[PDB]
Amino acid sequence: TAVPHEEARSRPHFPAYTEDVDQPMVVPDGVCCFNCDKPIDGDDINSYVWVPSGNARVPTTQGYFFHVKCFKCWNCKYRIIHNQFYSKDSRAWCLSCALGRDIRVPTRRWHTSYVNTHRTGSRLTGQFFPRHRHQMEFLF
């Protein structure tokens, strides 16, 4: 947002469930598991993770989508630590085992990450009402 001069939220720097009617944030109709290529149910399941970025990559709303058992690292076949992954040659590669840091195992759980479900993973990205100027509400 370009809130006029740093007039954003004081205590958390973000409010909860700012009005999302501007962009409907609807799951696609054509979809794929970003790493395993599995079709994904629409909105009544948690077995798919939405990665709604400021950018848009995969389907039509193009926030990434995995299956809950499809988020694992690819060459190194582990959960991705800190949830900062790395898409190597169109496959999300575990940051360490991708970057030449040839790890051998994580500590917590080696085959299921700590991803969220239903866009909950990325809830601190934009999409407030004053993203675009949206002054048409105020003028004349």
């Binding site: 700012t18 009005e19 009617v21 501007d22 009402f129 949206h134 048409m136 509400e137």
Partner: peptide
């Protein structure tokens, strides 16, 4: 709300 004004408008 704000956006609700932005809604009916």
């Amino acid at each position: 709300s704000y956006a609700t004004l932005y809604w009916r408008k």
